């Protein structure tokens, strides 16, 4: 048909690259460190975690 | 007391060279079917001199197989010496 | 544990349960999905895709069973723990509280090359 065989597979990447983003929510447990490492007042630590 | 060392020396009736050998298998199979009475009598005293009153049937059940089963294994000893006419433990054919 | 010869007792109510889209349950029956494809190939099917009524009913079986079995596994590792802390909690005499100290204290060896 449309050749599912072909480049449909590279879509496996973003499939996977999302999974590496599934964990960061459960690895949040430290927002606190002294090395700057701040998560101090900003809306930066707030994103990505 | 003493009756427990006889019969015990009797229950070394096993003696195994004379348990499988030498030929006339019927002698081997024999000292087997009389390996009982060393199991029976020995267990017909300890049950008895002290009153267990309950295991007393066990002596009966030590025969009812000892005859039933040992009478099976006689059967084969026809099949061996049917095809031969002499038992003679000296048949080895299946090897390893 | 208790209520012997039970696949799982009533106490497993409090566990999540292990619902689908976990890689294993998908993987479970995958190893069956590569099993079905065999099932043809032994006899010279020679389809390599043969009737979907054999080429399915496997995948149906595994993941159901793989699922229905994972429900108790996760349980067991819970009753393992449960029975540990509750013992670790009592007999505090067998469980000391270590002190706090490191730098300015400990010496190591000290063996450089």
């Amino acid at each position: 048909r449309d050749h599912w065989v072909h480049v449909l597979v590279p879509m496996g990447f973003v499939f996977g690259y999302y999974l590496d983003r599934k964990n960061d929510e459960k690895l949040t447990a430290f927002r606190n460190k002294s090395l700057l490492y701040k998560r101090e007042l900003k809306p930066n630590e707030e994103v990505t975690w | 007391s003493m009756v427990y060392m006889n019969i015990m020396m009797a229950f070394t009736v096993s003696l195994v060279g004379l348990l499988m050998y030498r030929s006339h298998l019927m002698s081997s199979l024999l000292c087997l079917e009389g390996m009982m009475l060393s199991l029976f009598v020995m267990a017909a005293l300890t049950i008895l001199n002290s009153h267990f009153t309950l295991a007393s049937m066990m002596p009966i059940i030590l025969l009812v197989f000892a005859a039933c089963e040992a009478a099976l294994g006689l059967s084969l000893l026809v099949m061996v010496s049917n095809t031969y006419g002499t038992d003679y433990v000296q048949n080895l054919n299946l090897l390893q | 544990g208790r209520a012997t010869f039970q696949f799982l007792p009533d106490e497993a109510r409090s566990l999540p349960p292990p619902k689908l889209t976990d890689p294993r349950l998908a993987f479970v029956g995958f190893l069956g999905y590569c099993s079905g494809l065999i099932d043809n190939a032994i006899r010279r099917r020679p389809v390599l895709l043969a009737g979907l009524h054999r080429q399915l009913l496997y995948i149906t079986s595994f993941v159901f069973v793989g699922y229905y079995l994972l429900k108790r596994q996760d349980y067991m590792y819970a009753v393992r723990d449960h029975d540990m802390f509750s013992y670790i909690k009592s007999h505090p005499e067998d469980f000391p509280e270590k002190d706090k100290k490191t730098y300015g204290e400990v010496f190591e060896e000290f063996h450089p090359v």
Partner: protein, 50 residues
């Protein structure tokens, strides 16, 4: 002299599997006498009664 020492292991064992098969052939008497040595030799030897 690298190949003598290690492949000596090859033709070391493969011979001892010729003494565990060849010399055991046959004679149902010959096994049975040897269970008896084993069942006594466990008496004298060691912890087995202790």
């Amino acid at each position: 002299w690298l190949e003598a020492i290690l492949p000596k292991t090859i033709s070391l064992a493969q011979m001892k599997a010729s003494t565990l098969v060849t010399n055991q052939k046959g004679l149902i008497k010959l096994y049975f006498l040897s269970f008896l040595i084993t069942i006594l030799i466990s008496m004298i030897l060691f912890n087995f009664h202790e």
